[PDB]
Amino acid sequence: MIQEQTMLNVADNSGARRVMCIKVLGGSHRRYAGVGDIIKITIKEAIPRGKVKKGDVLKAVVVRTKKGVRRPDGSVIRFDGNACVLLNNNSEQPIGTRIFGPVTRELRSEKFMKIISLAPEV
Amino acid sequence: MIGLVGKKVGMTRIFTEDGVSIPVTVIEVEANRVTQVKDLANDGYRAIQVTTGAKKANRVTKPEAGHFAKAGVEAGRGLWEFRLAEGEEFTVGQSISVELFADVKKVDVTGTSKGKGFAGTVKRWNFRTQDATHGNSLSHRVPGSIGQNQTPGKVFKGKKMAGQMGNERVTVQSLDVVRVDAERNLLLVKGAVPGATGSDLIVKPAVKA
Amino acid sequence: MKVRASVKKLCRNCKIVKRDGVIRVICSAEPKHKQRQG
Amino acid sequence: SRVAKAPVVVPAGVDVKINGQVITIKGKNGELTRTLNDAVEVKHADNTLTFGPRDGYADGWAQAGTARALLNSMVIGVTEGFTKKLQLVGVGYRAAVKGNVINLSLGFSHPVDHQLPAGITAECPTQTEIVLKGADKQVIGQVAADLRAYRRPEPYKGKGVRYADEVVRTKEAKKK
Amino acid sequence: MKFVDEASILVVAGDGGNGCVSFRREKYIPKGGPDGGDGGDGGDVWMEADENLNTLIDYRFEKSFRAERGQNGASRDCTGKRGKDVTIKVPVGTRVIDQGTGETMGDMTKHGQRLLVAKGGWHGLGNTRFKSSVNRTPRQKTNGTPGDKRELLLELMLLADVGMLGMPNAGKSTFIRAVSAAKPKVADYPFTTLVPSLGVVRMDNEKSFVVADIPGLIEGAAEGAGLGIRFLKHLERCRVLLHLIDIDPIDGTDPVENARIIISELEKYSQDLATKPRWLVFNKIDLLDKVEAEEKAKAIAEALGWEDKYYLISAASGLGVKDLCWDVMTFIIENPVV
Amino acid sequence: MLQPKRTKFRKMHKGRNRGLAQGTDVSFGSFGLKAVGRGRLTARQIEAARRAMTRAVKRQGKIWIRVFPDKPITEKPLAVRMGKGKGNVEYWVALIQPGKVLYEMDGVPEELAREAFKLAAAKLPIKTTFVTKTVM
RNA sequence: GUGAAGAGGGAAACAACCCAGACCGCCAGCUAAGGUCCCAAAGUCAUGGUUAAGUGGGAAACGAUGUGGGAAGGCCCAGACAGCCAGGAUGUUGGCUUAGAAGCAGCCAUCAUUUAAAGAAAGCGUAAUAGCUCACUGGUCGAGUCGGCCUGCGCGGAAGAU
RNA sequence: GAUGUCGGCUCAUCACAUCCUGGGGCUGAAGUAGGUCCCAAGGGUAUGGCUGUUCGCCAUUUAAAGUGGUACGCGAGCUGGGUUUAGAACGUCGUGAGACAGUUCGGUCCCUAUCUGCCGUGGGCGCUGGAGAACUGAGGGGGGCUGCUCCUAGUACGAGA
Ligand SMILES: Nc1nc2c(ncn2[C@@H]2O[C@H](COP(=O)(O)OP(=O)(O)NP(=O)(O)O)[C@@H](O)[C@H]2O)c(=O)[nH]1
Ligand SMILES: [Mg+2]
Ligand SMILES: [Zn+2]
């Protein structure tokens, strides 16, 4: 699962390489974030020439979960490494132009088509 | 209309045409027989007493044997009373089938849950376990404080601490029925029901919307 | 509407009435004169 | 008190019977019965109605006047009838009458259905006009109030249901 | 709603918290010391620049905005919470002048700008902050500094793209009917409108422009004695200044002189409005039923001596309204400087 | 701020408010304000009432003050043990008995004086009443 | 004065409050404070009133067509008040200032005509004309009405934690 | 003649002078959203950095991160982080021993439940011949939270936003 104070990777080419999930949105007493959720992250290290810098705080969308994703037919989608897509604070729009890595089909269910469209896999 | 009384033999998933797995509970129901019918004149309320299964003759004693013989019904595992619906009428000795649940599409299951014995405060009331380090001594799963100082001077009733869990009636509401079999006498209900395998279960129509 | 201990006819069209054991003022001209706690 | 000092006179073709403290003023416009307070006495007399209190009662004439007013209302209700006038102002405000069923649409997400009493009839000569006919003033007043409570007009545009003779307040409000 | 300027608002900065003189006494220490928490910082009033807002109707009633009092310092070294900030919504283009030695603190530039108008009062220090060798049991109390009581005058500049100027005899107000639906007062008497009103002509979803109707003036309005020339101030921001000339006026009966009298006050307001590219169109064309309409409109064109492109429009219904809007928005496109 | 400029003694006993009043007859005006109950009249109340009356009467007519504090009141400061001598003087009050005349008015009509006294009664910590000048 | 150094009765309990100062015993009577619906012993006693709030049975400044009594005042059958039916202008859009001031955005005089009455005048509305009132008058209705004081008993003001 | 103090953890309860949800009045209430006042305690009422901190500032969510009482709730439930017996040091006072509601480091938290209280489970007796079953219900106990989207409807309102 994904919770606060969690070391997270990146699935986009915005410029960040490792991001820190420190807050999860959705409601009061929010404990964990699934595969499609809105979370608050802080940059821990990024390319100096990238679109983002060190210490910036912005919203992110989960793409892969280490625990897995529960399919309606009793199937779990495990992953090796948890990443996220950088999004603007005011508007839920991706910052990076490309997505590197597998993407689950659940993101389409909750109306997240920007990541799905420019994803060279599922 | 009334429900049925049955026994749980297990539970298994069901595959749909679109591939979605529906985990349902398998409950076998025997053809119940009406043993007594109550009316306003005698008991002041309308209800019917039914029995299910069979019981060995040696174990059956004279009182219940005569009670069964009065209604012309053989021995049964147990007796239960179901309240009518102000207009539905039943006669003594007629058998109760299972196909009548073909339209309710929502059932309520009541039964005796699994007995956990004497359970602790953490397991019973989902309390928070204290720290196991930082100097803590002989207090990890203890409830802790159970009241205020001498101003109340007592422990209020209904306070939450360790006790005996299970072995009690538990009601689960708004359970969807998937399939019912008449020739095999099986009922498939979506979800999980209380109790262990082989325990007696009582299924009733859903009372809520 | 205002609730205050002291109730008085602010204007000429303030009628003092006793409703359910308490003093109330009804103003047919405009509802700013409604009072309670008489 | 002083209002009860003037006896009321029932018109021709109206029969009045007394069975204790119950009064019936049935006639051309239907039949109705009203119970009294067990404290004011009405005496059978010539073609008029008189009212009097009972010795030992503090209220007496204070409620005798109320009884006189109620009888004055019911006699004209059973001889002439009671009419209530209601009109609709504003777009999207549709109303019609079908039998003893009236439907109201005041911009809601669902039609509003109201049930009329047995002795109350409603008609819609105009699409935005409803007239209530009844034999008792209290019943028609309650019906009109119930209809009005759904869409009580605001003092900004005046949209809603209203009486013909009533006046609404218009406020010139501008901010935000 | 309607565009009205000269809004006045009074705001008070939050008063600072009040310290408390308390002493600490424990189970085994009768002499603990002065233990009084300091007060909370007073509330600070703030403001925001809103692109969406274009009117000051929300401040016409001189509402008093109160910043909550800073929490008083509680005993046992409990510091009071600072007062919450008060934010007032302000449109773009407003300048603020105080009452008494008034000056412009700032001018609105872009949406989201923050400007400080009154700083909150300082917190009141408790007895814990003044203990020393000289005095070991402080009994004095320091009250928080009072907030800033200031009077603010909000003046708003017109944000419309098209400005209207003409005599009251012209159908300037009814011109809005053919181009938009704003419902101002339209009637056959002069000085029908008393305050400028706004309106938008959205012929397409992608492109639209805002046109505002301004009350007319009289021949003597340049010097005064009427509504003055103060409503000419709501100009110099519109890209084009539409002008209507009332053909064959019922009460005027002099189209030659009233057409040129418009420029008389125009050339003497402050700087002749920098000779912006104003247009010239006529109204009440439907009154003239046939060919007679246009030769006199062309005849009056030579009186002005401008000889550029002219439009024949009737404000009652259509008749050149649909295509004149296209020409008005066309001039908007090439010139993006406001 | 009504307070004697010089006093023979700085402090006064608590005293009592027994007996009846002396200044019950009007001898300076036509409309007089008379107390109904016992109480303590601080100076602050006196000048507050005087300012209220000046505001009410639109600065016309004559105003008479029939009461003066002439008595100091001592209050102990906060967090001070009992004893250690008497406290210092903070405010001066006037003790009056029921029937004492407070204020007297002249040059005003009946309704104006009545409404002024009604306004004054709010600032007065004790019940008051309206009286008029009577011969002898 | 009481307790200390006084028992007992009453104030539900309650040394210091009221009555009352115990030599002992009695299955006798009479009283003090306090009570007589019961718990718990004694009036569901008699006479004439007040209270509608459970006031009794905790509380103030102030407010109120709550109610009872008292002394008075104005208008009163040469028709008393409130309702109802009508009138309520004539020079005159008064002058000035005013796009618009016709009564009711500003100032002024505020006199003066036929009337049972009309004020260049108080309130709503119109930019202003309009259109509604008010003061006032006429007619029907017909007997108390209006507003000042004192006093008893009532209401609100009256929100804290087992 | 004695660990008994503040804070933190677990456990909560009660009042409404109500933070949200609920029902309204007025408004200088076009609408959404706002201000004030009334009724209403059924439910809910945050995560981290700093400091021991209660309280606070900061960052980010939510409907809110309510006000108080209960020996400033709760140490025969836990922690000993503050202060603090015995050690030592810094700055000040005192010639000095020593002291400092001046600061730093370190520095023993006992008890096998007798009674009432509470949680569960049993034995005797009674319910009037005995016994086996099945039920009505006098009473008591448990829960009563809501965010977002869509249709209504870009409808009413609104010049447009
Ligand atoms: N037939 C016709 N009548 C017109 C036309 N334009 C105006 N009118 C008439 O002339 C009148 C002019 O008055 P109005 O439009 O109110 O003038 P305004 O724009 O308000 N000017 P101001 O605000 O300065 O008084 C209109 O009310 C209308 O009766 C037109 O195109 N055709
Ligand atoms: Mg105009
Ligand atoms: Zn009023």
Side-chain angles (χ1 to χ4, degrees), chain D residues 20-83:
Chain D
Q21 295 297 321
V22 297
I23 187 66
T24 64
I25 193 66
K26 70 179 180 68
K28 177 177 70 177
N29 211 346
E31 171 178 0
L32 62 93
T33 306
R34 170 167 284 279
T35 179
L36 272 297
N37 58 1
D38 291 331
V40 60
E41 296 83 12
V42 60
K43 274 77 67 178
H44 201 196
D46 296 330
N47 181 14
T48 192
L49 285 170
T50 64
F51 307 91
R54 180 178 290 120
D55 201 2
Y57 285 163
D59 57 357
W61 283 87
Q63 202 161 356
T66 291
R68 172 248 189 269
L70 260 67
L71 273 71
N72 189 179
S73 293
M74 65 184 73
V75 293
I76 57 154
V78 302
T79 58
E80 191 178 0
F82 278 126
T83 78

Coordinates of all heavy atoms in Angstrom, one line a residue, chain D residues 20-83:
Chain D
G20 N -77.7 19.1 22.2 CA -76.8 19.3 23.3 C -75.8 20.5 23.1 O -76.2 21.6 23.0
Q21 N -74.6 20.1 22.8 CA -73.5 21.1 22.5 C -73.0 20.9 21.1 O -71.8 21.2 20.8 CB -72.4 21.1 23.5 CG -72.9 21.6 24.9 CD -73.4 23.0 24.9 OE1 -72.8 23.9 24.2 NE2 -74.4 23.3 25.7
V22 N -73.8 20.3 20.2 CA -73.4 20.1 18.8 C -74.4 20.8 17.9 O -75.6 20.8 18.2 CB -73.4 18.6 18.4 CG1 -72.3 17.9 19.3 CG2 -74.7 17.9 18.7
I23 N -73.9 21.6 16.9 CA -74.7 22.4 16.1 C -74.5 21.9 14.6 O -73.4 21.6 14.2 CB -74.3 23.9 16.3 CG1 -75.3 24.8 15.5 CG2 -72.9 24.2 15.9 CD1 -76.7 24.7 16.0
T24 N -75.6 21.9 13.9 CA -75.5 21.5 12.5 C -76.2 22.7 11.7 O -77.3 23.1 12.0 CB -76.2 20.2 12.2 OG1 -77.6 20.3 12.5 CG2 -75.6 19.1 13.0
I25 N -75.5 23.1 10.6 CA -76.0 24.2 9.8 C -76.2 23.7 8.4 O -76.0 24.5 7.4 CB -75.1 25.5 10.0 CG1 -75.8 26.7 9.4 CG2 -73.8 25.2 9.4 CD1 -77.0 27.2 10.2
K26 N -76.5 22.5 8.2 CA -76.6 21.8 6.9 C -77.6 22.5 6.1 O -78.6 23.1 6.6 CB -76.8 20.3 7.0 CG -78.2 20.0 7.5 CD -78.4 18.5 7.6 CE -79.8 18.2 8.1 NZ -80.9 18.5 7.1
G27 N -77.5 22.5 4.8 CA -78.4 23.1 3.9 C -78.1 22.9 2.4 O -77.7 21.8 2.0
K28 N -78.2 24.0 1.6 CA -78.0 23.9 0.2 C -76.6 23.5 -0.2 O -76.3 22.7 -1.1 CB -78.4 25.2 -0.5 CG -78.1 25.2 -2.0 CD -78.6 26.5 -2.6 CE -77.7 27.7 -2.2 NZ -78.1 29.0 -2.8
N29 N -75.6 24.0 0.5 CA -74.2 23.9 0.2 C -73.5 22.8 1.0 O -72.3 22.9 1.4 CB -73.4 25.2 0.3 CG -72.3 25.3 -0.6 OD1 -71.8 24.4 -1.2 ND2 -71.8 26.6 -0.8
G30 N -74.2 21.7 1.3 CA -73.6 20.6 2.0 C -74.0 20.5 3.5 O -74.8 21.3 4.0
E31 N -73.4 19.5 4.2 CA -73.7 19.3 5.6 C -72.4 19.3 6.4 O -71.4 18.7 6.0 CB -74.4 17.9 5.8 CG -74.6 17.5 7.2 CD -75.3 16.2 7.4 OE1 -75.7 15.6 6.3 OE2 -75.5 15.7 8.5
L32 N -72.4 20.0 7.5 CA -71.3 20.1 8.4 C -71.8 20.1 9.9 O -72.9 20.6 10.1 CB -70.4 21.3 8.1 CG -70.9 22.7 8.3 CD1 -70.7 23.2 9.7 CD2 -70.4 23.6 7.2
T33 N -71.0 19.6 10.8 CA -71.3 19.6 12.2 C -70.1 20.1 13.0 O -68.9 19.7 12.7 CB -71.7 18.2 12.7 OG1 -72.7 17.7 11.8 CG2 -72.1 18.2 14.1
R34 N -70.4 21.0 14.0 CA -69.3 21.5 14.8 C -69.7 21.4 16.3 O -70.8 21.6 16.7 CB -69.1 23.0 14.5 CG -68.2 23.8 15.5 CD -67.8 25.1 14.9 NE -66.8 25.0 13.9 CZ -65.5 24.9 14.2 NH1 -65.0 24.8 15.4 NH2 -64.6 24.8 13.2
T35 N -68.7 20.9 17.1 CA -68.9 20.8 18.5 C -68.6 22.1 19.2 O -67.8 22.9 18.8 CB -68.1 19.7 19.1 OG1 -68.3 19.5 20.5 CG2 -66.6 19.9 18.8
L36 N -69.3 22.3 20.4 CA -69.1 23.5 21.1 C -68.1 23.3 22.3 O -67.4 22.3 22.3 CB -70.5 24.0 21.7 CG -71.3 24.9 20.8 CD1 -70.6 26.2 20.5 CD2 -71.7 24.2 19.5
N37 N -68.0 24.3 23.1 CA -67.0 24.3 24.2 C -67.6 23.7 25.5 O -66.9 23.7 26.5 CB -66.5 25.7 24.5 CG -67.6 26.7 24.8 OD1 -68.8 26.3 24.9 ND2 -67.2 27.9 25.0
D38 N -68.8 23.3 25.5 CA -69.6 22.9 26.7 C -69.7 24.0 27.7 O -69.9 23.8 28.9 CB -68.9 21.6 27.4 CG -69.1 20.4 26.5 OD1 -70.1 20.3 25.8 OD2 -68.2 19.5 26.6
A39 N -69.6 25.3 27.3 CA -69.6 26.4 28.1 C -70.5 27.5 27.7 O -71.0 28.3 28.5 CB -68.2 27.0 28.4
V40 N -70.8 27.6 26.4 CA -71.7 28.6 25.8 C -73.0 28.0 25.4 O -73.0 26.9 24.8 CB -71.1 29.4 24.7 CG1 -70.7 28.5 23.5 CG2 -72.0 30.5 24.2
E41 N -74.1 28.6 25.7 CA -75.5 28.0 25.4 C -76.1 28.8 24.3 O -76.1 30.0 24.3 CB -76.3 28.0 26.7 CG -75.8 27.1 27.8 CD -74.8 27.8 28.6 OE1 -74.6 29.1 28.5 OE2 -74.1 27.1 29.4
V42 N -76.7 28.1 23.3 CA -77.5 28.7 22.3 C -79.0 28.3 22.5 O -79.2 27.1 22.8 CB -77.0 28.3 20.9 CG1 -77.0 26.8 20.7 CG2 -77.8 29.0 19.8
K43 N -79.9 29.2 22.4 CA -81.3 29.0 22.7 C -82.1 29.0 21.5 O -82.0 29.9 20.6 CB -81.8 30.1 23.7 CG -81.6 29.8 25.2 CD -80.1 30.0 25.5 CE -79.8 31.5 25.5 NZ -78.4 31.8 25.9
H44 N -83.0 28.0 21.3 CA -83.9 27.9 20.2 C -84.9 29.0 20.3 O -85.6 29.1 21.3 CB -84.5 26.5 20.1 CG -85.1 26.2 18.7 ND1 -86.0 25.2 18.5 CD2 -84.8 26.8 17.5 CE1 -86.2 25.2 17.2 NE2 -85.6 26.1 16.6
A45 N -85.1 29.8 19.2 CA -85.9 31.0 19.3 C -86.5 31.2 17.9 O -86.6 30.2 17.0 CB -85.2 32.2 19.8
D46 N -87.0 32.4 17.6 CA -87.5 32.8 16.3 C -86.3 32.8 15.3 O -85.2 32.4 15.6 CB -88.2 34.1 16.3 CG -89.5 34.0 17.2 OD1 -90.1 32.9 17.3 OD2 -89.8 35.1 17.8
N47 N -86.6 33.3 14.1 CA -85.6 33.2 13.0 C -84.4 34.1 13.3 O -84.1 35.1 12.7 CB -86.2 33.6 11.7 CG -85.2 33.5 10.5 OD1 -84.2 32.9 10.6 ND2 -85.6 34.1 9.4
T48 N -83.6 33.7 14.4 CA -82.4 34.3 14.8 C -81.7 33.4 15.8 O -82.3 32.4 16.3 CB -82.7 35.7 15.5 OG1 -81.4 36.4 15.6 CG2 -83.3 35.5 16.8
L49 N -80.4 33.7 16.0 CA -79.6 32.9 17.0 C -79.0 33.8 18.0 O -78.4 34.8 17.7 CB -78.5 32.1 16.2 CG -79.0 30.9 15.4 CD1 -77.9 30.4 14.5 CD2 -79.5 29.8 16.3
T50 N -79.2 33.3 19.3 CA -78.7 34.1 20.4 C -77.7 33.2 21.2 O -77.7 32.0 21.1 CB -79.9 34.5 21.4 OG1 -80.5 33.3 21.9 CG2 -80.9 35.3 20.7
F51 N -76.8 33.9 21.9 CA -75.7 33.3 22.6 C -75.6 33.8 24.0 O -75.9 35.0 24.3 CB -74.4 33.5 21.9 CG -74.3 33.2 20.5 CD1 -74.7 34.1 19.5 CD2 -74.0 31.9 20.1 CE1 -74.7 33.7 18.1 CE2 -74.0 31.5 18.7 CZ -74.4 32.4 17.8
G52 N -75.3 32.9 25.0 CA -75.2 33.3 26.3 C -74.2 32.4 27.1 O -74.0 31.3 26.7
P53 N -73.6 33.0 28.1 CA -72.6 32.2 28.9 C -73.3 31.4 30.1 O -74.5 31.6 30.3 CB -71.7 33.3 29.4 CG -72.6 34.5 29.6 CD -73.7 34.4 28.6
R54 N -72.4 30.7 30.7 CA -72.9 29.9 31.9 C -72.3 30.6 33.2 O -71.1 30.9 33.2 CB -72.4 28.5 31.8 CG -72.8 27.6 33.1 CD -72.4 26.2 32.9 NE -73.2 25.5 31.9 CZ -72.7 24.9 30.8 NH1 -71.4 24.9 30.6 NH2 -73.5 24.3 30.0
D55 N -73.1 30.7 34.2 CA -72.6 31.4 35.4 C -71.5 30.5 36.1 O -71.6 29.3 36.1 CB -73.8 31.5 36.4 CG -73.5 32.6 37.5 OD1 -72.5 33.2 37.4 OD2 -74.4 32.8 38.3
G56 N -70.5 31.2 36.5 CA -69.4 30.5 37.1 C -68.2 30.3 36.2 O -67.2 29.6 36.6
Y57 N -68.2 30.9 35.0 CA -67.1 30.7 34.0 C -66.5 32.1 33.8 O -67.1 33.0 33.5 CB -67.6 30.1 32.7 CG -68.0 28.7 32.8 CD1 -68.7 28.0 31.8 CD2 -67.5 27.9 33.8 CE1 -69.0 26.7 31.9 CE2 -67.7 26.5 33.9 CZ -68.5 25.9 32.9 OH -68.8 24.6 33.0
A58 N -65.1 32.1 33.9 CA -64.4 33.4 33.8 C -64.5 33.9 32.4 O -64.7 35.1 32.2 CB -62.9 33.2 34.2
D59 N -64.4 33.1 31.4 CA -64.4 33.5 30.0 C -65.7 34.0 29.5 O -65.9 35.2 29.2 CB -63.8 32.4 29.0 CG -64.7 31.1 29.1 OD1 -65.6 31.1 30.0 OD2 -64.4 30.2 28.4
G60 N -66.7 33.2 29.5 CA -68.1 33.6 29.2 C -68.3 34.2 27.9 O -68.2 33.6 26.8
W61 N -68.5 35.6 27.9 CA -68.8 36.3 26.7 C -67.6 36.3 25.8 O -67.7 36.4 24.5 CB -69.2 37.7 27.0 CG -70.6 37.8 27.5 CD1 -71.1 37.7 28.8 CD2 -71.8 38.1 26.7 NE1 -72.5 37.8 28.8 CE2 -72.9 38.1 27.6 CE3 -72.0 38.3 25.3 CZ2 -74.2 38.3 27.1 CZ3 -73.3 38.5 24.9 CH2 -74.4 38.5 25.8
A62 N -66.4 36.2 26.3 CA -65.2 36.2 25.5 C -65.2 35.1 24.5 O -64.8 35.2 23.3 CB -63.9 36.1 26.3
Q63 N -65.6 33.9 24.9 CA -65.8 32.8 24.0 C -67.2 32.7 23.3 O -67.3 32.1 22.2 CB -65.5 31.4 24.7 CG -65.2 30.3 23.8 CD -64.5 29.2 24.5 OE1 -64.2 29.3 25.7 NE2 -64.2 28.1 23.8
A64 N -68.2 33.4 23.9 CA -69.5 33.5 23.2 C -69.3 34.3 22.0 O -70.0 34.0 21.0 CB -70.5 34.1 24.2
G65 N -68.5 35.3 22.0 CA -68.3 36.1 20.7 C -67.6 35.2 19.7 O -67.9 35.3 18.5
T66 N -66.6 34.4 20.1 CA -66.0 33.5 19.2 C -67.0 32.5 18.5 O -67.0 32.3 17.3 CB -64.9 32.7 19.9 OG1 -63.8 33.6 20.2 CG2 -64.3 31.6 19.0
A67 N -67.9 32.0 19.4 CA -68.9 31.1 18.9 C -69.8 31.8 17.9 O -70.2 31.2 16.9 CB -69.7 30.5 20.0
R68 N -70.2 33.0 18.2 CA -71.1 33.8 17.3 C -70.4 34.0 16.0 O -71.0 33.9 14.9 CB -71.4 35.1 18.0 CG -72.2 36.1 17.1 CD -71.3 37.3 16.8 NE -72.1 38.4 16.1 CZ -72.1 38.5 14.8 NH1 -71.5 37.6 14.0 NH2 -72.8 39.4 14.2
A69 N -69.1 34.4 16.0 CA -68.4 34.6 14.8 C -68.3 33.3 14.0 O -68.4 33.3 12.7 CB -67.0 35.1 15.1
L70 N -68.1 32.2 14.6 CA -68.0 30.9 13.9 C -69.3 30.5 13.3 O -69.4 30.1 12.1 CB -67.6 29.8 14.9 CG -66.1 29.4 14.8 CD1 -65.2 30.5 15.3 CD2 -65.8 28.1 15.6
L71 N -70.4 30.7 14.0 CA -71.7 30.5 13.4 C -72.0 31.5 12.2 O -72.6 31.1 11.2 CB -72.8 30.6 14.4 CG -73.2 29.3 15.2 CD1 -72.1 28.9 16.2 CD2 -74.5 29.4 15.9
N72 N -71.6 32.7 12.4 CA -71.8 33.7 11.3 C -71.0 33.2 10.0 O -71.4 33.4 8.9 CB -71.3 35.1 11.7 CG -71.7 36.2 10.7 OD1 -71.4 37.3 10.9 ND2 -72.3 35.7 9.6
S73 N -69.8 32.7 10.2 CA -69.0 32.2 9.1 C -69.7 31.0 8.5 O -69.8 30.9 7.3 CB -67.6 31.8 9.6 OG -66.9 33.0 10.0
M74 N -70.2 30.0 9.3 CA -70.7 28.8 8.8 C -72.0 29.0 8.0 O -72.3 28.3 7.1 CB -70.8 27.7 9.8 CG -71.8 28.0 10.9 SD -71.9 26.7 12.2 CE -70.3 27.1 13.1
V75 N -72.9 30.0 8.5 CA -74.1 30.2 7.8 C -73.9 30.7 6.4 O -74.6 30.3 5.5 CB -75.0 31.1 8.7 CG1 -75.5 30.4 10.0 CG2 -74.4 32.4 9.0
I76 N -73.0 31.7 6.3 CA -72.7 32.2 4.9 C -71.9 31.1 4.1 O -72.0 31.2 2.9 CB -72.0 33.5 5.0 CG1 -70.7 33.4 5.8 CG2 -72.9 34.6 5.5 CD1 -69.6 34.4 5.4
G77 N -71.2 30.2 4.8 CA -70.6 29.1 4.0 C -71.5 28.2 3.5 O -71.4 27.7 2.4
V78 N -72.6 27.9 4.2 CA -73.6 26.9 3.8 C -74.7 27.5 2.9 O -75.4 26.8 2.2 CB -74.3 26.2 4.9 CG1 -73.2 25.4 5.8 CG2 -75.1 27.1 5.8
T79 N -74.8 28.9 2.9 CA -75.8 29.6 2.1 C -75.2 30.2 0.8 O -75.7 30.0 -0.3 CB -76.5 30.6 2.8 OG1 -75.6 31.6 3.4 CG2 -77.3 30.0 4.0
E80 N -74.1 30.9 1.0 CA -73.4 31.5 -0.2 C -72.1 30.8 -0.6 O -71.8 30.8 -1.8 CB -73.0 33.0 0.2 CG -72.5 33.8 -1.0 CD -72.2 35.2 -0.6 OE1 -72.3 35.6 0.6 OE2 -71.8 36.0 -1.5
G81 N -71.5 30.1 0.3 CA -70.2 29.4 0.0 C -69.0 30.2 0.2 O -69.0 31.5 0.4
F82 N -67.8 29.6 0.2 CA -66.6 30.2 0.4 C -65.7 30.0 -0.8 O -65.5 28.9 -1.3 CB -65.9 29.6 1.7 CG -66.4 30.2 3.0 CD1 -66.8 29.4 4.0 CD2 -66.4 31.6 3.1 CE1 -67.3 30.0 5.2 CE2 -66.8 32.1 4.3 CZ -67.3 31.3 5.3
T83 N -65.1 31.1 -1.3 CA -64.2 31.1 -2.4 C -62.8 31.6 -2.0 O -62.7 32.6 -1.3 CB -64.8 32.0 -3.6 OG1 -64.5 33.4 -3.3 CG2 -66.3 31.8 -3.7

